[PDB]
Amino acid sequence: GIVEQCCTSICSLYQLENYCN
Amino acid sequence: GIVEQCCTSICSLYQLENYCN
Amino acid sequence: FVNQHLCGSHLVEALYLVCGERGFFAT
Amino acid sequence: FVNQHLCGSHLVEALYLVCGERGFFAT
Numbered sequence: 001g002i003v004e005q006c007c008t009s010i011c012s013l014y015q016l017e018n019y020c021n
Numbered sequence: 022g023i024v025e026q027c028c029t030s031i032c033s034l035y036q037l038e039n040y041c042n
Numbered sequence: 043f044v045n046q047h048l049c050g051s052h053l054v055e056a057l058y059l060v061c062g063e064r065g066f067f068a069t
Numbered sequence: 070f071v072n073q074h075l076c077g078s079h080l081v082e083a084l085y086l087v088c089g090e091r092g093f094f095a096t
Contacts, residue, residue: 003053006048010047012089019057027080027083028075028076031074034087037075042091042093044082044085055073056086058073
């Protein structure tokens with residue numbers, strides 16, 4: 001999920017954005 | 022500049038982006 | 043250098059910023 | 070709630086994230 005992708009690892013803008021809405 | 026716009030105040034994505042490159 | 047992880051409350055802010063009008067869970 | 074200001078080192082990270090390929094001063 002977002003934590004694995006964006007916190008444990010480093011995520012891009014585009015990846016981050018599929019977690020909007 | 023960016024500090025006034027994004028730190029002292031709250032900036033949008035679009036505003037932030039004119040500080041790229 | 044700087045930390046490139048977005049955790050917890052910084053994650054919330056990054057979402058606020060990038061999601062804009064259409065919002066995000068769990069605001 | 071959460072802090073919506075992007076200062077200093079959080080500002081650097083926000084730029085890293087949003088600027089992507091074309092970079093930013095002063096990386």
